[PDB]
Amino acid sequence: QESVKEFLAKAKEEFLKKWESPSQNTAQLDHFDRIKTLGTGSFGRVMLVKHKETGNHYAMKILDKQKVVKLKQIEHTLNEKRILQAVNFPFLVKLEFSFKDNSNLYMVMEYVPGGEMFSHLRRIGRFSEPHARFYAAQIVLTFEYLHSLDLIYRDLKPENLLIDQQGYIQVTDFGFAKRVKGRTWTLCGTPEYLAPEIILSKGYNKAVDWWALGVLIYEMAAGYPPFFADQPIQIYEKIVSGKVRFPSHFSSDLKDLLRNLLQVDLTKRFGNLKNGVNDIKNHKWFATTDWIAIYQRKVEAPFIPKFKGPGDTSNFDDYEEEEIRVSINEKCGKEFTEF
Numbered sequence: 501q502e503s504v505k506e507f508l509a510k511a512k513e514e515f516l517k518k519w520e521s522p523s524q525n526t527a528q529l530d531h532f533d534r535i536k537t538l539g540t541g542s543f544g545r546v547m548l549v550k551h552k553e554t555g556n557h558y559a560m561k562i563l564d565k566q567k568v569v570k571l572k573q574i575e576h577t578l579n580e581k582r583i584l585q586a587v588n589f590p591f592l593v594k595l596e597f598s599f600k601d602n603s604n605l606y607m608v609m610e611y612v613p614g615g616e617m618f619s620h621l622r623r624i625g626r627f628s629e630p631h632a633r634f635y636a637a638q639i640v641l642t643f644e645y646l647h648s649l650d651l652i653y654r655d656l657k658p659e660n661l662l663i664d665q666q667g668y669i670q671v672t673d674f675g676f677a678k679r680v681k682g683r684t685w686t687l688c689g690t691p692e693y694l695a696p697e698i699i700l701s702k703g704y705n706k707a708v709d710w711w712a713l714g715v716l717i718y719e720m721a722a723g724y725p726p727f728f729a730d731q732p733i734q735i736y737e738k739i740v741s742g743k744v745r746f747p748s749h750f751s752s753d754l755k756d757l758l759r760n761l762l763q764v765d766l767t768k769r770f771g772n773l774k775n776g777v778n779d780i781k782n783h784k785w786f787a788t789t790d791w792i793a794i795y796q797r798k799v800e801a802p803f804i805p806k807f808k809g810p811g812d813t814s815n816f817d818d819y820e821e822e823e824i825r826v827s828i829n830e831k832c833g834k835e836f837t838e839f
């Protein structure tokens with residue numbers, strides 16, 4: 501379809517111009533008031549902040565340079581910021597500013613007050629097939645966009661899908677995203693979502709994102725993931741086995757799509773065949789989906805999150821509030837020169 505082809509050609513031109521000349525140093529810490537911690541991690545946290553002059557709210561991701569180095573995430577952190585400042589798509593959280601100081605790296609993103617898909621899924625138990633299909637269609641279009649730019653995402657899971665005020669998805673956390681034209685080798689991702697070729701230490705490609713979509717659709721429609729077990733070693737054994745059990749309430753069309761996404765042989769997996777993404781878009785499970793209307797945000801969403809305004813944090817959870825310290829001496833300057 502020439503209209504999709506010309507869309508993706510323009511998308512790649514615009515991405516490459518920003519990729520080749522990344523923006524740097526577009527804000528500073530004392531232009532923001534700190535409001536609340538929204539999430540934590542091994543080397544960083546995300547905080548709700550308010551810009552002092554405009555009053556706008558943002559989600560500020562703060563990474564400690566010394567911890568990034570110790571946990572061997574330097575390349576990944578540079579990938580994350582360089583990719584985020586270059587992309588533009590309706591279902592991706594937008595990077596608004598970035599900067600660094602003696603101690604930390606900062607990525608200031610749009611704030612999405614509806615919270616994570618994960619919270620809403622675990623509260624209701626499972627989504628109906630139409631509800632799962634609405635979110636799945638947005639991921640299919642997002643992966644078509646990213647893959648056309650030679651980007652692998654590598655972190656699909658319900659916690660990384662935020663729900664906006666119109667009920668649409670915004671994908672966040674580009675910590676494992678990478679520009680890859682062929683194969684890549686790093687072990688990364690949450691256990692339940694890993695493709696077999698990652699578990700087996702192979703050189704793998706963008707087909708791992710389509711496997712992860714299969715896991716996400718199964719979990720949305722069942723309420724639990726397909727390879728669930730109590731410990732990672734047992735999860736990994738189930739993933740590599742080539743078997744799955746579907747609930748009887750799944751439609752036949754859903755089962756068929758999932759068998760083709762959760763295909764252990766990556767050379768036979770939907771999304772990775774000669775027709776690429778069109779084997780997924782044209783599948784019977786998606787027959788009711790108007791792909792253009794989803795992209796244009798014209799479909800009424802199945803669920804509108806409840807929140808009081810752009811400063812409401814009620815859909816995120818509570819964490820111990822810790823200082824943001826900035827040393828008087830510069831740390832790890834060489835490693836993060838390009839940030």
Ligand SMILES: N[C@@H]1CO[C@H](CNC(=O)c2ccc(F)cc2)[C@H]1O
Pocket residue numbers: 538539540541544545546559593609610611612613662672673675
């Ligand atoms: N666990 C670590 C700390 O929290 C990170 C993920 N959270 C976001 O990316 C985010 C949250 C809300 C929002 F409005 C925008 C972005 C993760 O790396």
